[PDB]
Amino acid sequence: SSDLRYPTTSQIKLSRAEFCGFERVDYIRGNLWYNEKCFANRESFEVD
Amino acid sequence: SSDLRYPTTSQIKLSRAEFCGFERVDYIRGNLWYNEKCFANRESFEVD
């Protein structure tokens, strides 16, 4: 998604990431890993 | 090749172009087309 803090069109605008050489049979075997950490007041050193 | 009119290292420096989605079975089936034209004095409107 483009971003969530700047509502402009009331509809999410998706951008497709590029991955060279990747067909459909690769995307069906692929996982997303993310560290669940809350950034409430958004200190400057906090990066996701 | 980098260029031919500015020799610097006495060895041709080749840069590999990118083709996202292309493996060896695609490179074995490919052809190069070029219009054989001589630009001796290299007029400004002449491009390759």
3D architecture notes:
The structure is cut from a larger assembly and holds two copies of chain A (48 residues). Chain A is low in regular secondary structure and 48 residues long. Helix content of chain A is 8%, strand content 0%. The first copy, chain A, has one helix at 24-27.
Number of strands of chain A: 0
Shape of chain A: flat
The most extensive interface, with participating residues per chain, is: A-B, 5 and 5 residues
Fraction of residues in H or I helices of chain A: under 10%
Span between termini of chain A: 15 Å
User: What is the helix/strand order of chain A?
Assistant: H
PDB class: protein transport
Keywords: sperm, hyperactivation, calcium channel, protein transport
Entry title: The atomic coordinates of the mouse CatSper trimer
Chains A, B: Cation channel sperm-associated auxiliary subunit beta
Task: Summarize this entry quickly.
This is part of a larger assembly, with two copies of chain A (48 residues). Chain A has 48 residues and is low in regular secondary structure. Chain A has one helix and no strands.
Write the layout of secondary structure elements.
The structure is cut from a larger assembly and holds 2 copies of chain A (48 residues).
Chain A: H1 24-27
PDB class: protein transport
Keywords: sperm, hyperactivation, calcium channel, protein transport
Entry title: The atomic coordinates of the mouse CatSper trimer
